[PDB]
Every structure is written in C-alpha cells, then in structure tokens.
C-alpha cells in the first residue's frame with residue numbers, strides 16, 4: 001500500500017558518477033561505455049506481495065520479481081550472478097546484491113516528483129534521477 005508511490009513508468013533524467021560506480025563494481029570498459037549511454041525507463045508494479053521492477057533500454061532489458069525480505073537470484077545487466085534481497089526500510093526500497101564476497105546496495109526513494117536511485121559500491125555512490133514518463 002505504501003509501495004504504491006513507486007508504481008508506474010519512470011524515465012531517467014540525470015546521472016552522476018555512474019561510470020565510477022561501475023568501475024568499482026568491476027564492469028569492463030566496453031560494457032561501461034554502452035551501459036553509461038543508456039537512458040532507461042524503469043517500470044515498477046505490484047501484484048499482491050510480488051513487486052516487479054523492469055528496466056528497459058537500448059543496452060539491456062531486465063526484469064526482477066520478488067517478495068520483500070526474501071532472497072532471490074538475479075543476473076544483472078552487466079552479467080553478474082548475484083544473490084539479492086530487497087526490503088522496505090522507512091519508505092526506501094533497499095536492494096542488496098552479493099556475489100564473489102562483494103556487496104553493493106541500490107536504494108530507491110521518492111523525493112518530490114522524482115524517484116531517486118542511489119547505487120553504492122564501497123565508498124563510491126552514483127545518483128540517478130528518474131521522473132514519471
């Protein structure tokens with residue numbers, strides 16, 4: 001019910017430090033270049049307890065479906081095989097991905113009419129701002 005503020009179709013309007021985030025994650029040069037060019041839409045829906053987040057771009061369409069607090073396997077757009085858990089903490093969707101003894105966290109929050117996505121890998125944060133399509 002509260003997760004309703006996230007539901008809809010969103011379009012990327014700005015990005016900061018995404019290349020640096022991808023470097024910290026271990027993404028190679030060619031994938032960074034093509035992924036960094038993408039202007040994805042993010043489509044979020046809910047059906048009962050199941051949340052679906054789709055990312056659609058010229059680089060790589062992805063779709064994850066999950067229940068809050070319940071681990072799932074995810075193949076990321078850059079082809080990492082990760083174990084993911086997504087929870088809703090104080091109104092923020094918090095997505096933790098674990099692989100090869102590493103961890104990254106993606107937070108999605110509503111701020112004004114934006115959906116702000118913060119991606120953190122060690123000390124490196126990328127901020128990506130989406131608005132309604």
Ligand SMILES: Cn1nc(CSc2ccc(Cl)cc2)cc1O
Nearest residue numbers: 022025035040077078117119128
């Ligand atoms: C935060 N984020 N992630 C994507 C998918 S593309 C992607 C590429 C490389 C990495 Cl490391 C993560 C994601 C699009 C977007 O706004």
